Design a protein around this ligand. Structure first.
Ligand SMILES: Nc1nc2c(ncn2[C@@H]2O[C@H](COP(=O)(O)OP(=O)(O)O)[C@@H](O)[C@H]2O)c(=O)[nH]1
Ligand SMILES: N#Cc1c(N)sc2c1CCCC2
Ligand SMILES: SCc1nc2ccccc2[nH]1
Ligand SMILES: [Mg+2]
Length: 169
């Protein structure tokens, strides 16, 4: 039948996880989404000629490591690790997110995509070369996005699906 891919969007509070997810699903930019609210979304799409269902969790709390929460995150098949290009700390947080994901999945090979969001901004503090190099060190794609303009949004999620497909093959 039609495969369902469980995707989890993670990253520091304020990087644009909710805005990215809502942009993917609803095709508009929500700029004041409650930072504490977690929700999930589904969307049927065709990727490389194969129809599939995306089941996406937009995470709120990024630091609750209960046994329940770990097992919940464990259901995730692919992770979008998002930072904001104007917050260096959010970029330096990525290392911890990847370590946590590897721990939770009990695997050194977890489908992941690094996402540098807010690319529409006229200023940035995270050099694109830094992010490219980090992504290469992890062996994962790097995608620049703007939830505001839609730039890279479909690309980020669909690239993650493609990463899951390769892993499962
Ligand atoms: N300029 C710009 N602002 C964004 C973008 N994505 C999110 N924001 C803003 O960043 C803030 C936090 O976004 P939010 O989606 O709530 O981030 P979250 O905490 O990771 O879910 C909000 O004020 C958004 O309006 C983007 O691509 N470009
Ligand atoms: N809160 C919380 C989280 C866990 N208990 S595991 C894990 C996250 C967020 C990032 C991914 C991996
Ligand atoms: S809330 C439904 C739902 N839970 C998930 C947990 C991980 C990835 C996708 C998910 N969708
Ligand atoms: Mg949010």
């Amino acid at each position: 039948g039609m495969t369902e891919y469980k995707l989890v969007v993670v990253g520091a509070v304020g990087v644009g996880k909710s805005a990215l997810t809502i942009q993917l699903i609803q095709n508009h930019f929500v700029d004041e989404y409650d930072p504490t609210i977690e929700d999930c979304y589904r969307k049927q799409v065709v990727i490389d000629g194969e129809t599939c269902l995306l089941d996406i969790l937009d995470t709120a709390g990024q630091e609750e490591y209960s046994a329940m929460r770990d097992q919940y995150m464990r259901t995730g098949e692919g992770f979008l690790c998002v930072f904001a290009i104007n917050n260096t700390k959010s970029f330096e947080d990525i290392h911890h997110y990847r370590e946590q994901i590897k721990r939770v999945k009990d695997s050194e090979d977890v489908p992941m995509v690094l996402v540098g969001n807010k690319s529409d901004l006229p200023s940035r503090t995270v050099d694109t070369k830094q992010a490219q190099d980090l992504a290469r060190s992890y062996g994962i794609p790097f995608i620049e996005t703007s939830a505001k303009t839609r730039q890279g949004v479909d690309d980020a999620f669909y690239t993650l699906v493609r990463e899951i497909r390769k892993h499962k093959e």
